[PDB]
């Protein structure tokens, strides 16, 4: 049971406003992945909680596109099928991603290997109809995949 | 329940390796925040879950530097409370940031309006491999921070 709510901007922001109000500079602490030391939390005024931060969802193609690099970076070829290739195909509604991946993600993208018989494909997302912008969105999200074997991420 | 395991990279490697031994092409699909059409969902062949891909650490403190700018970006116009302004400090363990977002966090930075008090203080991560005490590594970047944040309110997020 937490004696607090995940913040608003407009709370943030006045959460802000009492910190101007009393005017003593403030440190904010964030520790690594495993948080933080016994000193750091007996000196804290205060200790808040990073428990309902969340993977924007713009970024969960992102993360995708970098597990399946990951992946087939160690898979090992089979010299002995002579298939018709497997080719894998990412096709992801393309919601705006923050500034600060947009454009390194194109080039993350560029450094894949050659060999990597890889495509990211990114459908216009609708303008927020729910019902008739997801029959659009799927609609031409089928038509990239065609024939392929469908996997779903919901 | 559901009937599988989040991947790391080892079974994920071993999942691409059994569709290159089937040979047909596939496709991955990601919907929106609202998901994917009925249409979508009736012709999977599998329906797989994101719901255990969490926020990588090192985006952490993007996200509440992100949130602080939001947040200061609609206090008071610039009427200031006084001519001897709170300064607040955002001391974060500096993890590695992911190849996809490497400059771009610097940049976005970079534009902050100089008139935000705003500073980002970056602690060097501990080395943490198999060996790696993690209370010492703790112990240490807590130092590092405290050491930072000097005689300021502290307040802590984990």
């Given at each position: 049971?937490?004696?607090?709510?995940?913040?608003?901007?407009?709370?943030?922001?006045?959460?802000?406003e009492?910190?101007?109000?009393?005017?003593?500079?403030?440190?904010?602490?964030?520790?690594?992945?495993?948080?933080?030391?016994?000193?750091?939390?007996?000196?804290?005024?205060?200790?808040?909680?990073?428990?309902?931060l969340?993977?924007?969802?713009?970024?969960?193609?992102?993360?995708?596109?970098?597990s399946?690099?990951?992946?087939?970076?160690?898979?090992?070829?089979?010299?002995?099928?002579?298939?018709?290739?497997?080719?894998?195909?990412?096709?992801?509604?393309?919601?705006?991603?923050p500034?600060?991946v947009?454009?390194?993600?194109?080039?993350?993208?560029?450094?894949?290997?050659?060999?990597?018989?890889?495509?990211?494909?990114?459908?216009?997302?609708?303008?927020?109809?729910?019902?008739?912008?997801?029959?659009?969105?799927?609609?031409?999200?089928?038509?990239?995949?065609?024939?392929?074997?469908?996997?779903?991420?919901?």
């Open positions: 049971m937490i004696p607090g709510k995940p913040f608003d901007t407009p709370q943030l922001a006045a959460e802000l009492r910190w101007k109000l009393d005017g003593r500079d403030v440190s904010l602490l964030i520790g690594g992945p495993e948080g933080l030391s016994p000193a750091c939390k007996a000196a804290a005024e205060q200790s808040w909680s990073l428990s309902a969340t993977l924007p969802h713009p970024l969960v193609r992102v993360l995708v596109a970098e399946l690099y990951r992946a087939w970076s160690i898979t090992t070829n089979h010299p002995y099928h002579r298939e018709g290739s497997m080719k894998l195909q990412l096709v992801a509604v393309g919601t705006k991603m500034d600060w947009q454009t390194g993600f194109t080039e993350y993208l560029r450094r894949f290997p050659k060999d990597m018989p890889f495509e990211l494909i990114e459908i216009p997302a609708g303008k927020r109809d729910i019902k008739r912008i997801l029959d659009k969105e799927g609609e031409q999200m089928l038509a990239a995949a065609g024939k392929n074997r469908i996997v779903t991420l919901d």
